[PDB]
Amino acid sequence: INSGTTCSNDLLYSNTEVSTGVCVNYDLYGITGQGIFKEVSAAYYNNWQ
Amino acid sequence: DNETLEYWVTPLSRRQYLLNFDEHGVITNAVDCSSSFLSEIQCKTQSFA
Numbered sequence: 001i002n003s004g005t006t007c008s009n010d011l012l013y014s015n016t017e018v019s020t021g022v023c024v025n026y027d028l029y030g031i032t033g034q035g036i037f038k039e040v041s042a043a044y045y046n047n048w049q
Numbered sequence: 050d051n052e053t054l055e056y057w058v059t060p061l062s063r064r065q066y067l068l069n070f071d072e073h074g075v076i077t078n079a080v081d082c083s084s085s086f087l088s089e090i091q092c093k094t095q096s097f098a
């Protein structure tokens with residue numbers, strides 16, 4: 001639950017921008033919470049992570 | 050040509066390990082928590098040294 005790609009399309013909103021710097025509620029592909037995003041240059045994500 | 054075939058097989062079971070993840074995200078060390086007494090100390094302090 002709350003992670004994956006088998007989503008329920010009952011309640012619908014549109015995809016928004018990842019807005020960095022401000023405290024926001026996020027629903028990122030099932031993950032939910034509150035926080036502040038910061039864009040970074042990462043090299044540790046493989047094709048499955 | 051002095052070549053050999055090789056296939057090594059050992060059984061699996063459910064058990065607890067301590068895995069070390071390095072700077073890039075690669076598992077570099079592991080310890081089986083119930084194999085010796087040093088591994089008891091290592092899994093207890095959650096340290097490899």
Ligand SMILES: *[C@@H]1O[C@H](CO)[C@@H](O)[C@H](O)[C@H]1NC(C)=O
Pocket residue numbers: 021022023036
């Ligand atoms: C604080 O407010 C300033 C200006 O109103 C804004 O630029 C900044 O992103 C805000 N920071 C946070 C953490 O809300």
Ligand SMILES: *[C@@H]1O[C@H](CO)[C@@H](O)[C@H](O)[C@H]1NC(C)=O
Pocket residue numbers: 050051
């Ligand atoms: C294979 O091993 C034998 C062992 O005596 C050696 O004499 C021979 O030169 C080796 N041949 C090759 C192709 O490695």
